[PDB]
């Protein structure tokens, strides 16, 4: 017997709740990350969906 499932999803570098996803790369990234991407002309949209912000 053995198990090892990861629950919450946090950036492997920032370790912060991932509330975004980069299309181009097709991977999930955190908020801080976005900055870089959004700067490199990378498409990024919120997972949870639309919010007040
Ligand atoms: Zn990150
Ligand atoms: Zn990107």
Pairing of strands 27-29, 44-45: unpaired
Cβ atoms of residues 46 and 19 within 8 Å:
yes
User: What residues have CB less than 8 Å from 11, skipping those under 6 apart?
Assistant: 18, 29, 30, 32, 33
Half-sphere exposure of 4 (CA within 13 A, CB side): 2
Containing structural domain, residue 31: 1-53
Helix (H, G, I), strand (E, B) or coil at 36: helix
User: What residues have CB less than 8 Å from 4, skipping those under 6 apart?
Assistant: none
Q: How far is the CA of 11 from the centre of ligand 1 (A)?
A: 5
Q: How far is the CA of 53 from the centre of ligand 2 (A)?
A: 21
Tokens of 8: 């919450």
Q: Look at the chain and report how many structural domains it folds into.
A: 1
Q: How far is the CA of 52 from the centre of ligand 2 (A)?
A: 24
């Amino acid at each position: 017997g053995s198990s090892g499932s990861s629950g919450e999803s946090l950036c492997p570098q920032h370790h912060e709740a991932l509330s975004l996803f980069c299309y181009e790369d097709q991977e999930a990234v955190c908020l801080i990350c976005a900055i870089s991407h959004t700067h490199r002309a990378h498409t990024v949209v919120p997972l949870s969906g639309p919010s007040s912000g």
